[PDB]
Chain length 455, copies 2
Amino acid sequence: RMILIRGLTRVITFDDQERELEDADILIDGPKIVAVGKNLSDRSVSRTIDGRGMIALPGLINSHQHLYEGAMRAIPQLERVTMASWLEGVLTRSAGWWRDGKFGPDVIREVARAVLLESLLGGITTVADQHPFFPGATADSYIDATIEAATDLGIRFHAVRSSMTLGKSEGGFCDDLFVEPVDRVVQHCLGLIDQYHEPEPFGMVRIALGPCGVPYDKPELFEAFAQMAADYDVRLHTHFYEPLDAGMSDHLYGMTPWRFLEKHGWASDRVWLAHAVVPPREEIPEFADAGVAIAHLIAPDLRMGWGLAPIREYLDAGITVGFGTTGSASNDGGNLLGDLRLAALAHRPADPNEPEKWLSARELLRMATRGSAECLGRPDLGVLEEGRAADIACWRLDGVDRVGVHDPAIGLIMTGLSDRASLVVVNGQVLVENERPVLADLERIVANTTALIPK
Amino acid sequence: ERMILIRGLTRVITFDDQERELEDADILIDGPKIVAVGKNLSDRSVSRTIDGRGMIALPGLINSHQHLYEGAMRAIPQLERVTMASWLEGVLTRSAGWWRDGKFGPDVIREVARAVLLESLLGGITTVADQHPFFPGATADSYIDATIEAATDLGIRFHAVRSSMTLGKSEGGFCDDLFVEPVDRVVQHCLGLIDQYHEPEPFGMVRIALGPCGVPYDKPELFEAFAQMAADYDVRLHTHFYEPLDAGMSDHLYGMTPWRFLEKHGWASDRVWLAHAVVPPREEIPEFADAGVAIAHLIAPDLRMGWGLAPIREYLDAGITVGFGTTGSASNDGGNLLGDLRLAALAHRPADPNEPEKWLSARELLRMATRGSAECLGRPDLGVLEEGRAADIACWRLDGVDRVGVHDPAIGLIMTGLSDRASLVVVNGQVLVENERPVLADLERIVANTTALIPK
Ligand SMILES: [Zn+2]
Ligand SMILES: [Zn+2]
C-alpha cells in the first residue's frame, strides 16, 4: 500500500550532497520516504501519481506564525506604522475583541483552520505557531484550538507556548493582566507536553517553549524553560535583536540581549531565535559556537521598516538559518514561498558591487525547508531522502507564466503569477492535488471562518 | 449588438478625479467604452450580464516598460546574481548568438511575445508598452511587426517603442557594433512603423513610440531626430534614466548630467516618460516637474541589479507623474506587475524607519499601475473607471481562503494572497479572461508552441 510519485521533471533533495534529479521518482511507505530516484518499482504500490511537469521539494516549513492574526489582515490604521504603534494596535485588538466575546477559543480555531489551509495550499507542510501578542491566549484554550485545527487538516504542527511575564509595573512592557506567574506558565506547559507532545520520529504535534523576549519576560522564566528543555527534550524559542531591544536590555540588566540569554541558559543548541535584525557584529561568532539557530523573517522586517538582517554573515559563520512569515498582521499573508522572492531581491542593494554576497534561490529554498527543520529540531524533516518523513511539496512548471525558464529552482523564486502548490503530501497523506484540497472542504471553511472574523 | 453589464462588484476602485470607490456596484460597457459606473445600473439594452459579486474591480493594469523578447531568458543560472555590466553583456551575447544560429528571428519573438502578453492578461494587465532594441543585420527586421501581430491576435492594447543602440563602444559605447545601427536607419524605420501601425484616435489599440536605450547607449543626433519626429507626428518619447553609472558615463562623454543632456537635445518636455530614475541629483527633481516628464517606477529590476530605491515619494511630492512597470523577464524575471507592487510596498520602508507617512501606500501603488502608467503613455482614455473612458477592466476574487480576514480589499490585493491571477479581464470592451482562464485564446496550445521555440 505504498505511493509512487513518478516522472517528476525536477527533484530538489537538499540532502548532504545537495543532489537534484531529473525525470525521477519518490516512493512513499506510510509516513516515510522509501526511495528517491529514477525508474523506481511500482511493485508494492497501491497508487501512482503523475509527476511529469512538476518540481518537487521537501515540504516548506514555516518556523514562525501567529495564527490568531489571520483576523487582523489589511487593517487601514495598521498599514503604515512602526513597531510601537503596530504592537499597541495588535495588543489592543486581541485584548478588546477577547473581552467582548468576539475572540473565543472557537473563533481562533476557525481562523487557524483557514490560515493553516492556506499554508497547505502554499506548499507548507509544517507550521510553528506562537501567540506573543494575544494576552488572553491561555485564559481561553487557545493552543488547544490551534492543535485541533491542525490535526483536522493533517498539517504537521509545533505549538510554541508564549507569554509576557514581565509586568508593565515591575519593569515590564505589558498591561498587568497579560502577565502570568512563572510557575503558572511552567505548569501550563507541563500539562501541554503531557497531553499533546509527540516526541517519536514523524510525530505530528510538538510543544516548544517561547517567551516573547528579553524586554518582555522574567529571567526566572528563561531559566525554568532551560531546565524543562533538558528534561523533556523540547525546543526553546524567542525574539532576538529587534531594533531597540539592545537599549531596553541595557536599561534593565546593563547587558546585551545575547549576554542576558547566555546568563540564563539560552546560549545552547536547543534554541532558535526570530528576526535577529541588528546584533552587534562581534557577537556573531558566539551565536555560532553556542549552536543557536536563527529564523529569517523578511516580510515583517521590511514591513516595520527594520531592514535587512545579516543573513550572509550568519551563513558565513555556519549558523543554521530558517525562514518564516510571522503573523498576518505583519505580512500580511501566510505565503512563505512568495516571501522568498522578497528576500532574494531586497538583500541585493545592500551590497551593490558584490553579487557573490547576495542570497541565491537555492540558499533561500534551503532556509525554507532544511533550515527551518533544523530550527524546529526536526532531523526527520526538510530533506527528500530515504528515511525522512514523506512531507513533499510540488509545483507545476508548464504554465504560460513560466515559459522560457531555464533553471526550475530559480524559476520558482523569480517567476510566476501564483505560488499555489500542485501536489502536497504530509506524513505520507496526500492533502492537496491539482491545486485543490483533497479532504478539506474549501468553500465551507471559507464560509465558516469569514462569519467569525470580528466585524 | 448590445452592451455588457458587470453587476454587483463588491468593491470598485475608480481612480477618478475624486478617488471614488464603490461597493456592491456595477460597470456598464458599450463597445470600446464605459457607459456608466454606479449602483443598480439599468440592463435595458444589455446582451450579457456578468456576476461581479465577490470581486474587486480596478482599471486594467498598464505595464509601461517591457522587453518581451527577454521572456526566453528567464532564470539563467549564470545571470542570477550579476551587476549591470555583466548582466547587459550576458543578454547581448545570448541574443546575438541565438540570432546568428538562426534561433531568434521575428517568428520566434512573435511566440515569446504571445506568451508574455497572455501572461500579462492573466495578471490583469490590459495595456503593455514593449521597448524592443534588437535589430541585428544590415536591415531592420520585422521584430516589431511580430510583437504587434501577437498583441493584436490576443486583443491586448499595445504600445511598441522602437529602441536601438546607436553609439558603438568605438565612440564611447557598450556593444559589439552588430547591435549598432546608423541613426538614419533607425529614423527611416520608425517613420515606416508610424505610417503602418499607429492608431492615434481615442481607444486606439496599437501605438508607436520612439525609445533610444539611453544617454550612454545612443547618439545625441538620434535624440534630436526623435524630438522632431515626435512633434511632427504627435507620438511619445521614452528612454532609460539615471541608472547608477549613468551620471559618470554622461560626464565622461559629454561633460553634462543625463538630465542636462536630455534638455539640450529636445527631451525636456511633456512628450517624455522615463524608466527607473533611480539616482537623480535631488536639485534636478523640480526641473523634471516643470518640464512635465513622467517617470516609470520599476522596483523589481532596481532591486535585482542592486541599484536600490528610486526617490518615488519625492517625485509625488513634486507632482511628477509616476507610473509602474516590470521591465523584461531577463531582469525580473516575471511579467507579474501586481506582484511587483508588494515588493515596492515593503522594500521602500526601511529607507525611512521613523517616518511611516513617507512609505508608499497600497492605493498610491495601484494608482501608479493604472492611472500613472496611462499618463506615462499619454492615454487620457485609459487608467480610470468612469464614463467615457476605455472599457479596460481588471477584477480579482476576494473570497478565497488566502484572503479570509482581510479588512480593506485594496490593501488586501497587495498584502495578501497565494496568487495574483485575475478573475475577469476586459480590454476594449472584449472579455478576454473569465474564471482565471483565457476565453478566446487556447492557453495549452500557446504554452506548447512557444516552449518548443525557446532557444536551448
Ligand atoms: Zn513573532
Ligand atoms: Zn528597460
